[PDB]
Design a protein around this ligand. Structure first.
Ligand SMILES: N#Cc1c(NCC2CC2)ccnc1Cl
Ligand SMILES: N#Cc1c(NCC2CC2)ccnc1Cl
Ligand SMILES: [Cl-]
Ligand SMILES: [Cl-]
Lengths: 124, 5, 124, 5
């Protein structure tokens, strides 16, 4: 069923979560990538990334306020993926597709990986 | 907006 | 704009936030309505409700783990609105529209209020 | 799904 649905709701929720992120409101984690720091909400990171879901469902790790990622991870690539988590928008460019696909494979973000391949398989 | 899902 | 967008992303994020809520994963607040308890995430409540946004941006209130709502609020009405926050789906019925519109006006949920009126203005 | 927003 009887339920009615508000089409822009899920996107409106995301818009607000990103405004809370930009204003540093109720952010509970710091992600460190090559000496650069990214403040986020653990639940948004879990909802998006299979890696972060594994990290925050771990009895010891769920308690950490700071998470250091693999040193190979480019901070720009991570920043472009953190923005996608919060906006549904991916700033995919020829200059960053390699760095962004490598960051999405690591974070277990299947849909980013999928399209990332398609753009290079068409570029070749 | 509201729609039938 | 150059950005590409994944259409189901925002809804997928919401689907996962609701699965975390159902499994009681990283829930940080307890909402009390007429002796009944609702476990949620403060950021989702803020993203949806103008009342909860005011509560969790308040220097003293943001620190509370338990929030008691006005006694007039029906727990079923609140439960139906908490489900809408997490799913974008509203279980609107003739038997609950009065209790659900009164709960949406209090929580400052304009879009629920708007449609709630429309259904009664057409019922009269 | 991917689209041009
Ligand atoms: N949150 C969350 C979550 C999940 N996050 C990883 C997303 C990349 C898929 C996967 C499965 N189930 C849950 Cl509850
Ligand atoms: N979160 C959040 C939020 C907000 N929540 C209330 C929603 C009902 C609208 C309103 C305005 N700005 C922000 Cl950051
Ligand atoms: Cl993804
Ligand atoms: Cl609303």
């Amino acid at each position: 069923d009887s339920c009615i649905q508000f089409t822009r709701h899920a996107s409106d929720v995301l818009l607000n979560l990103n405004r809370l992120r930009s204003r540093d409101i109720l952010t509970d984690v710091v992600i460190v990538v090559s000496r650069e720091q990214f403040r986020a909400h653990k639940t948004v990171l879990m909802a998006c990334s299979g890696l972060f879901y594994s990290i925050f469902t771990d009895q010891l790790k769920c308690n950490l306020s700071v998470i250091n990622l693999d040193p190979e991870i480019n901070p720009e690539g991570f920043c472009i993926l953190l923005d996608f988590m919060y906006t549904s928008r991916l700033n995919l460019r020829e200059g960053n597709i390699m760095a962004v696909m490598a960051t999405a494979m690591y974070l277990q973000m299947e849909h980013v990986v999928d399209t990332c391949r398609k753009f290079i398989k068409a570029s070749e | 907006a509201w729609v039938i899902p």
